[PDB]
Design a protein around this ligand. Structure first.
Ligand SMILES: CCCCCCCCCCCCCC(=O)SCCNC(=O)CCNC(=O)[C@@H](O)C(C)(C)COP(=O)(O)O
Ligand code: SF4
Ligand code: SF4
Ligand code: SF4
Lengths: 309, 106, 176, 44, 112, 156
């Protein structure tokens, strides 16, 4: 039965990513006074299937990989880590309940970075390596601020247990207590997934299937990060007898956050590498440090230290 | 065993998909692109490495800052608060040093 | 006569500085832009349902060239060849011989649409309204040879589209 | 009689030709106060 | 008349030799850079052939301009501004050889 | 037979996927690129048909030659074309791309992109109206729909 749970966590997420592609297309189009995919299936519901079938039939070209071995491991690592990050998330009950689930999430995101380095290095392409290293630099800065914000917000949770966040936000959403950290956290999540305006347009050598899987892993990471934001700040009511209510509310929150991800994508011009790092090092980092000081001092000075257990 | 099972299932699923995406789709015959990778022949700028070493050190300081949630339960709250503020001040000082001096060039 | 874009000094009033810092810290202008795109989301999309819905077009539209006929059924083209001369891309090739009756009827009226620029000089030059660019813009082919239109192809195009071509000319000849 | 496409008697109506970007939002003091108030309620 | 670069033919020949040295030394690299299928000898043979094509010139001004044009082609070749086809264009390959015998030309066509 | 029925149905499925999710690359060279943009503009919205402008030629299926292919640009077009993965289709937009159009007798204009790359659909016009280009793409979709790659392999 546990294997059934694993499958019921993996397969639906992949299907959700597939339909998220269509949702993004339509949302961006209608924000551009356009109709997204509307011919391929009713309201484009068959568009993701068409895309997948076309991709898995397109001639895969070989990118002269210096190390097929590594070139193949990078997609596997990305997808596997993306799937694993969903496991600790409490939709009211988590699949695997870890006392330190938050740190597990952070570590999984940290390993995911290697997929980028491995892809570029094995690609045997100067432009590929340059772009990969730029991605390394971008994810480098997000991790620091992300970790600091997560620690600061969990200073009121009482532990790194993800399930406890529901109890902490039972009465009031965490955002009302830590809204600046929420802003920086959302922007940091955008930076992590390289979603605009933190893209670096112009791992492209990947052909068809490989590319498709990398794309799936990236979008699954988008959905997972939005879910993490939901659980952290947008707490949801959980009735122990009827968990479906929490599941519905949480899903709606995650969908809203992904829609905001697309909404930002088609609202702002893309940053520049210098500007992105002069944000994530000279604007966010000092403020994150100050807010971490504040969120350490506040529970002590207000006698609001959360329970350890 | 449950977490190990999850890891195994995820890894195997990803590897199976990589199989059906790297070897299955290339079975279909698509002629032959007799096209050689014409190559005929180094930007090791500090601008990149600096971003890396500084991240390593800040990540190290972040590691020292991780046990803070459990450290708030100590009876010696004043001492713990002072030490935590000290570590945060040192992080800020390191950032300030790099910013004030020739650093944060990214 | 001249307007100074930008060239606006910022007031250093503490209230003004406070609002500027509020814009910087609270990301107000980004939220304003985001709201603008959200407003665009709830508008009505401007996409037409091709090919079930066609875009607006005027009677003066220039498209597929077509050779017309008099109401009696005789080809209007009297082989003056001035449309061949005026053609800025030298796309029209006209060869004429006295017909069995004795009129100036072309034995070759070839226009390669792959070289024509669809300027419309040909229809403006023709003194008998024989060569008139039709309303059909959807005549894409799969082979290059098809684009090169013979005299027979032009006559058939004229016979097919004559109703619309005549209606458009009747609706525009006064302007010309 | 001549029937060219001509301006209507009296001409067309006025056409906006200047930037209309309006002013929206509270004052900086007020916005900061609202944020701090939300923070205070959250803290309590 | 103002000389372009060389006042005398001897000065012009000096420029010609300088250009020939540069082309002669560049040919090996060019074959490597564009991955040409010609041999280093073939490229150097072509260079000599091209120089010998304009071997009837007697005006230093014309020789100067020829050297300038030769330099420009070398600059593009060295800077990889030319492409592989551009370098191969010197070696006319697809073009069918046109015969010189009168009887052959008589058969081929009305060629004068 | 049953074998033919299975192969035919599978071939139709493959044909549907490619024609539904055609990914074109904008090889915008001249005036015709502007009308191509108007095709992707809200009024016509090629994306509505699943045709999304793929900047990467390595992930493209249709090369829309839009403009005058000059001799200087000619090698680049072919080199980009052979770096496209298969199946790859070429759509020639505009008289200049079709047979040189206004510049057919120019000293530095290729007399049609057909010489450099094999073309599947020729869109006439100067510039062809965005609907005509959209019509050509739909004609290409129908052309893909008629393709029977698997059937011929089975009947070989
Ligand atoms: C790949 C192969 C690329 C080959 C490119 C070679 C070129 O750049 S062709 C241009 C070369 N043209 C010249 O050097 C003009 C020389 N003009 C002359 O009049 C000479 O023949 C002189 C000055 C009489 C000297 O003749 P000698 O070398 O004594 O007899
Ligand atoms: S201008 Fe008119 S009448 Fe004269 S040759 Fe052309 S089509 Fe015929
Ligand atoms: S419309 Fe223009 S390009 Fe076409 S045949 Fe007439 S003159 Fe030539
Ligand atoms: S066909 Fe006409 S519009 Fe298109 S590139 Fe040529 S001249 Fe420009």
């Amino acid at each position: 039965m546990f294997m059934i749970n694993i499958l019921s966590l993996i397969i639906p997420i992949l299907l959700a990513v597939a339909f998220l592609t269509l949702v993004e297309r339509k949302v961006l189009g209608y924000m551009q006074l356009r109709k997204g995919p509307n011919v391929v299936g009713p309201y484009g519901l068959l568009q993701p299937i068409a895309d997948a079938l076309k991709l898995f039939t397109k001639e895969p070209l070989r990118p002269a990989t210096s190390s097929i071995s590594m070139f193949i491991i990078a997609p596997i690592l990305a997808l596997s880590l993306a799937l694993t990050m969903w496991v600790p998330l409490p939709m009211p009950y988590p699949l695997i309940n870890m006392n330190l689930g938050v740190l597990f999430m952070l570590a999984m995101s940290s390993l995911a970075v290697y997929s980028i380095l491995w892809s570029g290095w094995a690609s045997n392409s100067k432009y590929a390596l340059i772009g990969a290293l730029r991605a390394v630099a971008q994810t480098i800065s997000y991790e620091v601020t992300l970790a600091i914000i997560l620690l600061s917000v969990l200073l009121m949770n009482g532990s790194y247990t993800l399930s406890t966040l529901i109890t902490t936000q039972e009465h009031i959403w965490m955002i009302f207590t830590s809204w600046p950290l929420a802003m920086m956290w959302f922007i940091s999540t955008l930076a992590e997934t390289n979603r605009a305006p933190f893209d670096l347009t112009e791992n492209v050598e990947y052909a068809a299937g490989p590319f498709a899987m990398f794309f799936m892993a990236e979008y699954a990471n988008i959905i997972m990060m939005n879910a993490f934001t939901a659980i952290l700040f947008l707490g949801a009511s959980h009735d122990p007898h009827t968990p479906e209510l929490y599941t519905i509310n949480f899903v709606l929150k995650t969908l809203a956050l992904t829609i905001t991800f697309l909404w930002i994508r088609a609202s702002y011009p893309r940053f520049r590498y210098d500007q992105l790092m002069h944000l994530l090092w000279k604007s966010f980092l000092p403020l994150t440090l100050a807010l971490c000081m504040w969120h350490i001092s506040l529970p002590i000075m207000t006698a609001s230290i959360p329970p350890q257990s | 065993m449950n977490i190990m099972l999850t890891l195994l299932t995820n890894v195997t699923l990803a590897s199976l998909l990589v199989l059906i995406a790297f070897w299955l789709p290339q079975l279909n015959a698509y002629s032959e692109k007799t096209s050689p990778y014409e190559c005929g022949f180094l930007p090791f700028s500090m601008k990149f490495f600096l971003v890396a070493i500084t991240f390593l050190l800040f990540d190290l300081e972040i590691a020292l800052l991780l046990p803070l949630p459990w450290a708030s339960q100590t009876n010696n709250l004043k001492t713990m608060l002072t030490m935590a503020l000290f570590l945060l001040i040192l992080l800020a000082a390191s950032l300030a040093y790099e910013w004030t001096q020739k650093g944060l060039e990214w | 006569t001249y307007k100074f874009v930008n060239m606006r000094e910022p007031s250093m009033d503490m209230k003004s500085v406070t609002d500027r810092a509020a814009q910087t810290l609270l990301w107000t202008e980004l939220v304003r832009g985001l709201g603008m795109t959200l407003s665009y989301l709830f508008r009505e999309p401007a996409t037409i349902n091709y090919p079930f819905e066609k875009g607006p077009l005027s009677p003066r539209f220039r498209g597929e060239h077509a050779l017309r006929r008099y109401p009696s059924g005789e080809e209007r083209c009297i082989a003056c060849k001035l449309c061949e001369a005026v053609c800025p891309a030298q796309a029209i090739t006209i060869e004429a011989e006295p017909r069995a009756d004795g009129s100036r009827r072309t034995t070759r009226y070839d226009i390669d649409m792959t070289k024509c620029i669809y300027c419309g000089f040909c229809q403006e030059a023709c003194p008998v309204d024989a060569i008139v660019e039709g309303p059909n813009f959807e005549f894409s082919t799969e082979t290059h040879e098809e684009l090169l239109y013979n005299k027979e192809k032009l006559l058939n195009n004229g016979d097919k589209w004559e109703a619309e071509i005549a209606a458009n000319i009747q609706a525009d000849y006064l302007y010309r | 009689k001549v029937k060219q496409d001509m301006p209507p008697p009296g001409g067309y109506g006025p056409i906006d030709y200047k930037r209309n970007l309006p002013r929206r939002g509270l004052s900086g003091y007020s916005m900061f106060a609202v944020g701090i108030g939300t923070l205070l309620f959250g803290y309590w | 008349v103002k000389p372009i670069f060389s006042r005398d033919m001897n000065e012009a020949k000096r420029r010609v030799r300088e250009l020939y040295r540069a082309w002669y030394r560049e040919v090996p690299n060019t074959v490597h850079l564009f991955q040409l299928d010609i041999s280093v000898k073939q490229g150097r043979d072509k260079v000599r052939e091209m120089f010998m094509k304009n071997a009837h010139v007697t005006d230093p001004r014309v020789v100067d301009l020829l050297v300038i044009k030769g330099k420009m082609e070398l600059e593009e070749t060295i800077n990889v501004w030319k492409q592989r086809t551009h370098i191969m264009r010197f070696f006319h390959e697809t073009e069918a050889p046109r015969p010189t015998d009168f009887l052959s030309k008589f058969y081929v066509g009305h060629d004068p | 037979s049953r074998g033919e029925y299975v192969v035919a149905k599978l071939d139709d499925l493959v044909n549907w996927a490619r024609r539904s999710s055609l990914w074109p690359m904008t090889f915008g060279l001249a005036c015709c690129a502007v009308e191509m943009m108007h095709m992707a503009a809200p009024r016509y919205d090629m994306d509505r048909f699943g045709v999304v402008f793929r900047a990467s030629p390595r992930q493209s299926d249709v090369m829309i030659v839009a403009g005058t292919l000059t001799n200087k640009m000619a090698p680049a077009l072919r080199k980009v074309y052979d770096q496209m993965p298969e199946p790859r289709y070429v759509v020639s937009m505009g008289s200049c791309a079709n047979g040189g159009g206004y510049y057919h007798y120019s000293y530095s204009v290729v007399r049609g992109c057909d010489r450099i790359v094999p073309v599947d659909i020729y869109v006439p016009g100067c510039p062809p109206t965005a609907e005509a280009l959209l019509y050509g793409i739909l004609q290409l979709q129908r052309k893909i729909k008629r393709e029977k790659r698997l059937r011929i392999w089975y009947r070989r």
